[PDB]
Design a protein around this ligand. Structure first.
Ligand SMILES: *C1O[C@H](CO)[C@@H](O[C@@H]2O[C@H](CO)[C@@H](O)[C@H](O)[C@H]2NC(C)=O)[C@H](O)[C@H]1NC(C)=O
Ligand SMILES: *[C@@H]1O[C@H](CO)[C@@H](O[C@@H]2O[C@H](CO)[C@@H](O)[C@H](O)[C@H]2NC(C)=O)[C@H](O)[C@H]1NC(C)=O
Ligand SMILES: *[C@H]1O[C@H](CO)[C@@H](O)[C@H](O[C@@H]2O[C@H](CO)[C@@H](O)[C@H](O)[C@H]2NC(C)=O)[C@H]1NC(C)=O
Ligand SMILES: *[C@@H]1O[C@H](CO)[C@@H](O)[C@H](O)[C@H]1NC(C)=O
Ligand SMILES: *[C@@H]1O[C@H](CO)[C@@H](O)[C@H](O)[C@H]1NC(C)=O
Ligand SMILES: *[C@@H]1O[C@H](CO)[C@@H](O)[C@H](O)[C@H]1NC(C)=O
Ligand SMILES: *[C@@H]1O[C@H](CO)[C@@H](O)[C@H](O)[C@H]1NC(C)=O
Ligand SMILES: *[C@@H]1O[C@H](CO)[C@@H](O)[C@H](O)[C@H]1NC(C)=O
Ligand SMILES: *[C@H]1O[C@H](CO)[C@@H](O)[C@H](O)[C@H]1NC(C)=O
Lengths: 719, 719
């Protein structure tokens, strides 16, 4: 009865609710009621008990909580204060469940940067002022583990900037051994890496400088040391450095992830600074020296002949119940990424998945089953169904649990498992209204709808949503998957303006069977624009040829493939060849810009939000992974060839609107500053917009402002 | 016939020349020829010769020269490198003009700040790395005066940032005594003053950070010390601090200016930080104790009971031939600034000029003559003629040299007097094409035309310029002078969009009979826009009821007076009220914003280039002068009330265009960053533009862009 309105989108009127059980055992989870009460629901009995009242929570206005594995204590986390994507500080009030009171001995210090329970019992490890601390018991005086922490120079047990956003994707870098015997932790040195400096205008009379150690392409990188201390004899034995494989130590390198096996066995993944080689390292504990031994025989190489080791990140092993063998997804001989099963050497791995489709994530490995997500089903690469396979004996049996569960509503699934995988939740994201459901571990049968989104279902019932369709184009030897969003009563005999939404980042996939009533949904609903999104070269989950196509040649095929798609769309007949725009954020901004400046005639305008503008300016770990090194005898020539600044002249005849946040710690305002300056030097008009103090996300009312500004631009561009 | 173009204005096609004799005696001046030779002209004798060859200058590719008082040497300036507005860095070679080769040996150091000769002989004084050095013969080894010089921290003989822009308005802060027996310099200590920090993106991989000790409103000011040193025997006694007057030392104080009356007499001017009182001090070298003495009987208080002490700046004294008494422009008893002759006391002063107008500048005091510029001719505040009055003889005489020199073509004059005022040059700037002429000045007779501007006179023949008109409005006891620029073939009956150019800064004057082919000319010539510039309250040269009316109420009355004017312009009947814009720069961008957010629905749109947004962010010197202090006791409340941020809401339904250069060291980008931040927080769309690495001037290819971008805006706004 009525079209989406921009305020529907910016108020989240039609957001959906998800449900990920905060497991505490094989059969129990800790949700938070509408009453704000924190309830423990036992799945087997069906009984619900409330552990942690709204009141107790409110008394320290905690925004969050954490049960100790022994249920004796629960920490309440408050004064939440954000930093980067994942990191944040908080104050922590720990609470004694048995005595129903807060714990009084030696209060924890304020701003704590990370804190977690041990995996069993109720030991604490925390990070305060860049050092790791240990508590045997909630109310004890802390034991200092590291002493050399220093505000962005040296980090213990939390990453620095580059490792947070680009390697770990995690706010922490310490891992308890399975039963708490040991803590393993990373030490990052940022001391002589260059610094990104920018202004934050804040609220005072004087702006301040913000400085983050931030290794730009080719710049000097952080150095890592991984240590493990005995958690019961930390002073007696002291921290022991995990030995680094010779073929990793021989040049710059990275730690990529750590995975515990047993308490006496740890798996370390390294990545050579030239990131086409990954090493997996399995170390065992010696008792005679109380130290770690990593034998050559337990070093596993993973190479990429024609690209980079991994997908976006290296795959991590998930180990068998036996705690010797492991499973890992990587490229097979055909260039498709599949699950392999590894006992002794990696040269001997047995491939247990295969086909022109990819194993995307291994969720769980039990005694008999392995649960994983994949795009196999009906061979749409942008779907996620979750599958199980038998692991006891060759040929694995295969069951797609999700495929036909709700065939039409749900073709994009993630999974979350309870302990021992006694039960798991399935979360379907689309194409229909998302749904979270509870499933039996042994049988796969659903035992509870968790979140059905009845409100949304019903709120959407008066709203004439745009029609999404996902399809494919074969052009050369290259196939292009595309989502097309279309206005209600899309009369094909008429010519609609087209908007291309681009991202195109290496390892991305932007064409997905996901549900989202969003901005580009609204532009079709009310504004009469056709919207399209195109996955081509460098996009993932279709094998290595397509993935690694853009290696060292960034911002070439991405541009090419978008233009191709657009050409093919205008040729479909229903697209106003005179009203095509393109808009893109981050990597999207790069390609939005390179596309619009391609001397193609196709695009009449384009928008670039927080674009990279030259790989010189972006972080090493990301850039070098795809671009290699900006040296003269590596890849400097394409580093210089691939800026948007060089396209300076080709803006003269298109509307450009260029947007950026002045406090982007990830894609630096520098990027758009250089673009703007280049347009100025080439004497080219454009529209621009800064967001003071705002960062890469463009949060709060920025977002509001952002979309209102782009909407205006866009409505202008389509007269 | 043809209308003006943006190209015309941006190219400087219709720019004009000027002729200021570079005097070297009472009858000789040096000027650079068309084919770049430096030639000595004499007007007493009418002879010329090439004092410095064309190719000797190109031998070091210098761009400036400096002939010594004894004509034995000239300085040659190459490697000019701009710091701020007046400050710059250069290389100095000395040409032995007696021998016909360069001076070798004790070669001057690289990047020297400021350099100059004595007014007698050819002794050198220069500042290198913030420290004063002194030379006896141009080839002698330098004698260091100061030692405490530190980049960005201690400044000897040159100013810190705020003293340069806001106090002294000059690259230098050293002065020779008239015969060069002594040397006076300033010590500026910036140490404890907060730095302002901004990014400079440059061309390197990482931007760098620029810091400038910059005191914003109410912050820690620089401390000043002024010293005097014997030039002949500096080894003997060393540098001597000239006493600070008791009332001045009582609290915070600036050094306003220093003038030398004789070699044993010196004038110093001080400004109490609360700038309503200033103290003129005269000091004598006492022979016995070899230091300087300032009798408190020779302290002459100038205070204001209504506003700030002085004009824009405190006015300097011009001393009569007896080297004791002086002539100084200041507020008479009725509030109009006029010349006074102070013989011995302030109360004992005799008023020399009087009436409803202002003596703007004293140019020369002779044995029997005084030359001053004035507001007087036909009650027109917007033009300046030059007046000659007798002194020392009875039947007093007043002659206006220029009032009828060229009545219709020249009403805005300045003067350049040779030594002993033997000959003077007249430069007229409007309303017609500027022209520079040479005069006798015992007789005032015009001897010849130095710069006629026939190139410009002729090039403007193809061009239909707009009709300019400076009229005035009378409204509610307060009158407002204006200049209206009208389109060619202006139809009195038709209706025209109206653009207002606004500045409004206290002590300023925007309406002037000055020839200027500039942006607004183009917009009237081609675009059909009626333009108006209005001087209201806070505007100088019409006495103190006008000038001081803005004291402590900044932004209030100036906004109000553009509104009253616009309103009157509307009821003139040829202005389309639906199409009105206002635009400004610096202060002009402050009031344009405020006028646009006036909530009076008069302006459809407005542009603010590099606006001040809150007096909290601007330099102390300028700010406190007109605002007082931002404290509990003083004016805080109105610093608080008078920002643009506070008016964010009122922007909802106007078109705002906000422009600012990210390297603006004078009005910091923080100003525009905070307006932007406010508008977002209020959910108000607007247009913005930043200029990377550009300062307050927006010079270079940035100008093109800015002026192009703005006229796209107005054009669209006036669609
Ligand atoms: C350098 O100076 C010489 C001498 O003034 C210039 O040569 C003269 O050029 C003009 C025409 O511009 C002729 O009328 C003269 O006959 C030339 N005189 C001599 C001595 O050759 C020369 O043009 C100047 N070069 C520069 C830098 O412009
Ligand atoms: C905090 O938790 C308590 C405990 O359940 C809530 O108290 C109930 O509120 C409902 C509805 O307002 C009342 O009808 C009941 O009398 C209360 N107890 C029950 C469940 O029967 C309280 O509403 C919660 N809300 C907050 C944040 O204060
Ligand atoms: C300015 O510089 C002078 C020397 O020319 C210096 O004495 C002033 O204050 C000093 O600052 C020092 C460094 O911060 C400090 O250690 C010292 O105690 C202090 N001197 C005095 C007299 O106490 C500098 N100015 C300011 C405002 O501090
Ligand atoms: C905003 O969101 C809430 C809940 O999603 C909804 O009830 C409300 O009607 C929405 N509309 C606005 C703009 O407030
Ligand atoms: C951190 O790096 C610096 C400079 O490379 C070095 O001197 C210092 O010892 C390092 N600290 C360690 C090893 O934790
Ligand atoms: C760099 O720019 C474009 C990429 O689109 C390409 O056509 C051109 O040949 C390239 N030049 C170099 C240096 O290889
Ligand atoms: C720029 O200025 C030069 C010198 O005055 C003039 O000859 C030229 O015509 C101007 N503008 C253009 C059209 O390039
Ligand atoms: C400024 O000076 C006046 C006298 O001219 C005095 O009344 C006042 O105290 C000063 N300003 C303040 C602090 O109000
Ligand atoms: C990366 O390792 C490969 C092995 O596939 C090797 O040939 C190559 O020299 C290395 N560097 C790159 C990026 O070429």
């Amino acid at each position: 009865m009525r079209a989406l309105t921009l305020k529907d989108i910016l108020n989240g009127t039609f957001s959906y609710k998800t449900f990920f059980p905060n497991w505490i055992s094989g059969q129990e989870y800790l949700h938070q009621s509408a009453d704000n009460n924190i309830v423990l629901y036992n799945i087997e009995t069906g009984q619900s008990y409330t552990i942690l009242s709204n009141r107790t929570m409110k008394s320290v206005n905690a925004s969050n909580y954490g049960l100790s594995p022994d249920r004796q204590f629960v920490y309440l986390e408050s004064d939440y204060s954000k930093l980067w994507r994942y990191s944040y500080t908080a104050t922590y009030y720990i609470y004694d469940l048995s005595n129903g009171e807060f714990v009084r001995g030696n209060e924890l210090p304020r701003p704590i940067q990370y804190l977690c329970w041990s995996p069993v019992g109720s030991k604490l490890a925390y990070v305060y002022q860049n050092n790791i601390y240990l508590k045997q018991r909630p109310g004890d005086p802390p034991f200092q583990i590291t002493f050399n922490g220093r505000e962005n120079k040296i980090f213990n047990g939390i990453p620095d900037w580059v490792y947070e956003e680009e390697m770990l994707a995690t706010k922490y870098a310490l891992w308890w051994s399975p039963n708490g015997k040991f803590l393993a932790y990373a030490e990052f040195n940022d001391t002589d890496i260059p610094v990104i400096a920018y202004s934050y205008y804040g609220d005072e009379q004087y702006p301040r400088t913000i400085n983050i150690p931030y290794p730009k392409a080719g710049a000097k990188n952080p150095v890592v040391r991984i240590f493990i201390i005995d958690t019961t004899y930390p002073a007696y034995v002291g921290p022991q450095e995990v030995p680094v494989p010779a073929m990793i130590a021989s040049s710059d390198y990275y730690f990529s992830w750590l995975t515990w096996v047993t308490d006496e066995r740890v798996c370390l993944q390294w990545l050579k600074r030239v990131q086409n080689v990954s090493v997996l390292s399995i170390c065992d504990f010696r008792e005679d020296w109380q130290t770690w031994d990593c034998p050559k025989t337990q070093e596993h190489i993973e190479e990429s002949r024609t690209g980079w080791a991994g997908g976006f990140f290296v795959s991590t092993p998930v180990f068998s119940y036996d705690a010797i063998s492991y499973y890992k997804i990587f490229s097979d001989k055909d260039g498709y990424k599949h699950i392999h099963y590894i006992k002794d050497t990696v040269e001997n791995a047995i491939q247990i998945t295969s086909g022109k489709w990819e194993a995307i994530n291994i969720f769980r490995v039990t005694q008999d089953s392995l649960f994983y997500s994949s795009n196999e089903f009906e061979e749409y690469p942008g779907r996620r169904n979750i599958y199980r396979i038998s692991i006891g004996s060759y040929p694995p049996s295969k069951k797609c649990v999700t495929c036909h569960l709700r065939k039409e509503r749900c073709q994009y699934y993630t999974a979350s498992f309870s302990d021992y995988a006694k039960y798991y939740a399935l979360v379907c994201y689309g194409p229909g209204i998302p749904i979270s459901t509870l499933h039996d571990g042994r049988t796969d049968q659903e035992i509870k709808i968790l979140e059905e989104n009845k409100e949304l279902e019903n709120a959407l019932k008066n709203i004439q949503l745009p029609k999404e369709e996902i399809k494919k184009l074969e052009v050369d030897e290259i196939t292009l998957w595309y989502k097309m969003i279309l206005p209600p009563q899309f009369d094909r005999s008429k010519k609609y303006p087209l908007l291309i939404q681009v991202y195109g980042g290496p390892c991305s996939q932007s064409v997905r069977s996901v549900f989202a009533v969003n901005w580009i949904s609204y532009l079709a609903s009310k504004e009469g624009m056709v919207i399209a999104l195109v996955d081509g070269r460098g996009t993932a989950f279709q094998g290595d040829k397509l993935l690694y196509a853009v290696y060292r040649k960034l911002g070439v095929y991405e541009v090419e493939d978008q233009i191709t798609a657009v050409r093919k769309f205008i040729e479909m007949g229903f697209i106003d060849e005179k009203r095509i725009a393109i808009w893109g954020w981050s990597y999207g901004g790069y390609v939005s810009s390179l596309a619009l400046a391609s001397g193609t005639g196709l695009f009449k305008c384009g928008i670039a939000v927080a674009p990279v503008s030259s790989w010189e300016y972006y972080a090493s770990v990301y850039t070098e992974r795809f671009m290699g090194l900006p040296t003269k005898d590596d890849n400097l020539e394409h580093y210089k060839n691939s800026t948007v600044m060089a396209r300076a002249e080709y803006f003269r005849n298109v509307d450009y609107l260029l947007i950026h946040g002045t406090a982007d710690d990830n894609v630096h305002f520098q990027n758009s500053a250089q673009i703007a300056k280049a347009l100025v030097n080439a004497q080219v008009d454009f529209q621009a917009m800064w967001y003071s103090d705002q960062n890469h996300g463009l949060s709060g009312l920025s977002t509001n402002h952002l979309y209102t500004h782009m909407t205006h631009f866009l409505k202008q561009c389509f007269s």
